[PDB]
Write a structure and sequence with these properties.
The structure is cut from a larger assembly and holds chains A, B, C, D and E. Chain A is an alpha+beta fold. Chain A contains three helices and seven strands; from the N terminus they run ββαβββαβαβ. Helices cover 22% and strands 33% of the residues of chain A. In chain A, the strands form two sheets. Chain A has a three-stranded antiparallel β-sheet. In chain A, strands 5-4-6 form a three-stranded antiparallel β-sheet. Chain A is elongated. Chain A starts with a strand and ends in a 21-residue tail after the last strand. Chain B is α/β, with parallel strands linked by helices. Chain B folds into two domains: 147 residues, Ribosomal Protein L13p, Chain: A (Alpha-Beta Complex); 50 residues, Single alpha-helices involved in coiled-coils or other helix-helix interfaces, CATH 1.20.5. Chain D is an all-beta fold. Chain D is globular and about 40 Å long. The two termini of chain D are 25 Å apart. Chain D has one domain: Beta Barrel (Thrombin, subunit H), CATH 2.40.10.190. Helix content of chain D is 0%, strand content 44%. By secondary structure, chain E is α+β, with helices and mostly antiparallel strands. In chain E, the strands form four sheets. In chain E, strands 11-12-7-13 form a four-stranded antiparallel β-sheet, covered by helices on one side. A three-stranded antiparallel β-sheet of chain E has the order 1-6-5, with helices on one face. The longest helix of chain E has 22 residues. Chain E is elongated and about 60 Å long. Chain E starts with a strand and ends with a strand. The chains are: A alpha+beta, B alpha/beta, C alpha+beta, D mainly beta, E alpha+beta. At the B-E interface, loops of B face loops of E. Strand 7 of chain A pairs antiparallel with strand 2 of chain C. Chain B binds two RNA strands through strand 1, helix 4, strand 5 and helix 7. The PDB classes it as ribosome.
RNA sequence: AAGCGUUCAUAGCGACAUUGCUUUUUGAUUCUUCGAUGUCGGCUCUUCCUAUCAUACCGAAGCAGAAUUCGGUAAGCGUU
RNA sequence: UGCUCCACACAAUAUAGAUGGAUACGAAUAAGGCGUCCUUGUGGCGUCGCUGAACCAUAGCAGGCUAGCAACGGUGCACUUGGCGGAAAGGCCUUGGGUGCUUGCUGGCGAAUUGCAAUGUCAUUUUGCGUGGGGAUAAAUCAUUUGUAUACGACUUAGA
């Protein structure tokens, strides 16, 4: 599913004879399609307001893609992740080009770091870091230093044949 | 492509080498393994011994002369990593082991022929840099195989003779390349360059 | 009185390192490293070759010795002008690597009659050079 | 010249088969160097032959021969499926079978 | 974590020349020379002006990046072995039975022997490594000085003395007897 | 780890608990054998286990040495 | 007129599988290969690798015949000088000569009826009858017997 897309969502309670024209809550949702996004919305509004999707309705669904979708940027992202024996808040800072692509990475490594599947990850808020020197993760700050230069040593080489004859080099 | 290939196992994971050989046998390729003593297994050498002694202890109890024959030669320890690695019980598997010739070191006449390698099973390509690899040339010495020295000088003797072979080859290789460039630039090569050669 | 050490030169990873993409929709075009994300993901742009300015894992690309300076986080047109100014493409084709790839695909396209020509042509270059070896 | 084959070699792998069930109906073939089902269709459909030597001659040839057609690609490694007019004797595992270039499709 | 880069500085004084290919090093200086393998470290070396050597690691993990500081602490130790040399002055402490050591050449092979240890007749010969010279510091009681270039070998020899004179099957904490390193000095005082 | 252990909770321990393994005990049950699987103990015979009694090497101590006690690798060797 | 080995048939069966070529450094890879140069190295400088998709070879009735040209080569085929090679050497390389082919080049000659494809056969073994040459002219066992041996075997004996 990891080919996520940020589907912006607006939902509202069903109209009632007492108070029509309801509150019309809105949310951004990170999901692999329109469908999961629709319910993922319903999961979150299931939390913060007395409403279920049967008693409510989805006024609209739309797609989101970054204004400059090929510009690198730093993301400051909060999340609560359901631990093995509980749950904790969690504040990572990941540097990726697309807002969705950041989550593509984030859901991947959180599953690696603390074995939290896509099931229980609740992104509290994604906050793209608007400038530099305001992040607090060294593994990102080391990408914020100037003239980032380094080699990629020990290059791997795929082989389309099971046999070679060269004792392949590894220089790169 | 070559029906009988002299495969060299220098710096090759024993497991990964086994499969890329397990396949080729069952495709029917004639396979001769050489330089088998100094194959590589992934893990710390000390622990590579422990797992063997655990396997070494494993034997039938009622008659220790008919149980799992714990071979010791580096070629044979690799060979055992081909039994079970290949369906040895059936005749097809038996014919597979028939068409496989594991040969420690470089016995004749394969020395005078090309030692193919396996890109996949290479230690350099597969191991994370800095991880603990282990050569079987020292392990088999540490676990009973007793011919480390004799193969050491024998391989030493072949290498110093082979080096001269290459030294003679390089001399001739130089002259053919020198004549290549000298005869190059000719109009015939001009078609070749345009044509694709 | 002289100390000797070898730097063991690599193909460095930097903004301004001309790259060759290997696999994917492009699979063989040239690009410049726009900006690095991490050690396994970078930014590439192919205005001279039609490769859309994108972020790609390094696994689908291979670095080149080629080198040219341009600002980080650059845009497509900014990439283009320096690409044209430094004449990277032409000197890329000047690299012996370029000929090998080209003749590889040139070989992949030559036809049977061309094959038969080389069959004859290889024998002409054979005889001409072989006598020189014999005279040698 | 020195080569007279007008076929591409083919190593016969095995039966179309599951773990503990094998099917004589379909057999698997590998062509040397062919890589992907992207360019395996080129060999797909061609007439293919299993040549072998018999102890006694039958019809003016000690070399009895088996006929079959390659049907479809198989896996992602360029292995192809082939049906033979007479199923392989299962001794052919690892035997080089010929892959002819007709019916031509170019 | 894999820091993309890590750096260390090797301060080579002008009296020492360095030759490094692969991971094999060889210094040349007035004291002599030393050669050591590093085939298990996976680092990089480079130079500024043939006085500063820059060792580096790219994309190294925490356990990996530790070694980068070690080898710098190793190579400068090479320098001090060839610009200073390492002096290990020893002490022959004993309760009642004094320690006697015999500079003795068995057969072309030098071994230092421990005799009179607790009045015991053990021929406790100990091998001595190359360049490691044994001299009794005169004018001061119960010292032995181990002089040599390679800090590892000179210390390893001294460590061997520590263990070879190790009193057994007794509560050592008051059986203070044995052999002990007074100081970890240098051949030259600079 | 409350306390004992001169002083010191953890040399030795170690109250109040509390978390494991075992089938070498004995439990509970009845899955197996009622058209037979010979049931204790002894004799002798051998292998295996370690959760070590001595033996090799060590470590600790309220271990001056000996006797010591705990602890480690250790089933090779023995255990009348 | 046994037996073996050299040449050939040919006849048989027998094939875990020929249908261009196993086309030969080592070591290392966070490093080398190759080339030039020398104040000879852990050297200088340069090139190169980023796939064997490479190198050779490869055209001729399934590879026939004939003529000619530019050369002194390739290239079989065997011969021969030698050398090398004991890890399972059993092969490698070389001198020299002859031999055929040569598609380096030009020409000419014949290809047909298997009739629209029907592998359209070209190998590797070994034997068996024989061809026609070479070499060579024995053991073992039973039985008798001895005991260092023994249930019987076996072993150890001795015996023109």
């Amino acid at each position: 599913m990891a080919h996520f897309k940020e589907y912006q969502v607006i939902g509202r309670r069903l109209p009632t004879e007492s108070v029509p024209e309801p509150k019309l809550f809105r949310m951004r949702i990170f999901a692999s399609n329109e469908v999961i996004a629709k319910s993922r919305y319903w999961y979150f509004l299931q939390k913060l307001h007395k409403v279920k999707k049967a008693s409510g309705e989805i006024v609209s669904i739309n797609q989101i893609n970054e204004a400059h979708p090929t510009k690198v940027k730093n993301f400051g992202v909060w999340v609560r992740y359901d631990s093995r024996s509980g749950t904790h808040n969690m504040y990572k800072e990941i540097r990726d080009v697309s807002r969705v692509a950041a989550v593509e990475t984030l859901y991947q490594d959180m599953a690696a770091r603390h074995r939290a599947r896509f099931r229980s990850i609740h992104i509290l808020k994604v906050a793209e870091i608007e400038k530099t020197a305001d992040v607090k993760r060294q593994y990102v700050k080391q990408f914020l230093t100037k003239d980032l230069k380094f080699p990629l040593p020990h290059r791997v080489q795929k082989s389309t044949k099971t046999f070679s004859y060269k004792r392949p080099s590894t220089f790169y | 492509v070559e029906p009988v290939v002299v495969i060299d196992g220098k710096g090759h994971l024993v497991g990964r080498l086994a499969s890329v050989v397990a396949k080729q046998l069952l495709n029917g390729q004639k396979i001769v393994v050489v330089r088998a003593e100094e194959l590589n297994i992934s893990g710390e050498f000390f622990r590579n011994k422990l797992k063997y002694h655990d396997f070494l202890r494993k034997a039938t109890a009622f008659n220790k002369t008919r149980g799992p024959f714990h071979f010791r030669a580096p070629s044979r320890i690799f060979y055992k990593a081909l039994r079970g690695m290949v369906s040895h019980k059936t005749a097809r598997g038996k014919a597979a082991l028939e068409r496989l010739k594991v040969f420690e070191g470089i016995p004749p006449p394969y020395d005078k022929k090309k030692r193919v390698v396996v890109p996949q099973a290479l230690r350099v390509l597969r191991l994370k840099p800095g991880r603990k690899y282990t050569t079987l040339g020292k392990l088999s010495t540490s676990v009973g195989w007793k011919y480390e020295d004799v193969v050491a000088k024998l391989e030493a003797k072949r290498k110093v003779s082979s080096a001269e072979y290459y030294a003679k080859k390089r001399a001739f290789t130089k002259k053919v390349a020198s004549a290549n460039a000298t005869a190059a630039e000719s109009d015939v090569a001009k078609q070749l360059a345009a044509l694709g050669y | 009185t002289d100390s000797i050490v070898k730097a063991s030169n690599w193909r460095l990873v930097e903004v301004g390192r001309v790259v060759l993409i290997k696999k994917g929709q492009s699979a063989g075009k040239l690009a410049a490293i726009v900006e690095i994300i991490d050690q396994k993901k970078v930014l590439i742009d192919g205005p001279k070759a039609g490769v859309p300015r994108q972020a790609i894992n390094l696994g689908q690309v291979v670095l080149t010795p080629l080198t040219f300076a341009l600002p980080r986080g650059a845009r497509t047109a900014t990439v283009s002008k320096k690409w044209a100014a430094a004449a990277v493409c032409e000197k890329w084709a000047a690299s012996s690597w370029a000929k090998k790839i080209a003749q590889r695909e040139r070989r992949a396209a030559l036809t049977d009659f061309e094959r038969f020509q080389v069959m004859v042509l290889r024998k002409q270059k054979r005889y001409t050079v072989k006598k020189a070896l014999a005279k040698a | 010249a020195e080569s007279h084959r007008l076929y591409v070699k083919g190593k016969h792998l095995s039966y179309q088969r599951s773990k503990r069930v094998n099917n004589p109906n379909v057999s698997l073939i590998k062509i040397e160097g062919v890589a992907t089902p992207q360019d395996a269709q080129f060999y797909l459909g061609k007439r293919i032959a299993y040549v072998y030597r018999a102890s006694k001659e039958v019809r003016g040839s000690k070399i009895r021969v088996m006929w079959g057609k390659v049907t479809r690609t198989h896996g992602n490694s360029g292995v192809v499926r082939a049906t033979f007019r007479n199923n392989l004797p299962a001794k052919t595992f690892g035997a080089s079978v010929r892959i002819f270039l007709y019916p031509s499709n170019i | 974590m894999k820091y993309i880069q890590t750096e260390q500085q090797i301060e080579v004084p002008e009296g020492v020349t360095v030759s490094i290919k692969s991971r094999i090093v060889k210094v040349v200086g007035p004291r002599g020379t030393l050669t050591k393998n590093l085939k298990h470290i996976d680092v990089t070396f480079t130079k500024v002006n043939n006085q500063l050597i820059k060792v580096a690691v790219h994309n190294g993990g925490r356990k990996h990046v530790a070694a980068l500081r070690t080898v710098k602490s190793l190579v400068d130790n090479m320098i001090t072995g060839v610009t200073k040399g390492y002096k290990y002055k020893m002490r022959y402490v004993y309760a009642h039975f004094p320690i006697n050591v015999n500079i003795v050449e068995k057969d072309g092979a030098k071994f230092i022997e421990v005799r009179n240890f607790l009045g015991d007749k053990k021929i406790r010969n100990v091998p001595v490594r190359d360049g490691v010279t044994i001299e009794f510091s005169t004018n001061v009681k119960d010292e032995i000085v181990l002089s040599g270039n390679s800090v590892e070998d000179v210390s390893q020899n001294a460590a061997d003395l520590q263990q070879i004179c190790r009193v057994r099957n007794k509560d050592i904490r008051k059986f203070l007897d044995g052999i002990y390193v007074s100081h970890k000095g240098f051949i030259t005082e600079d």
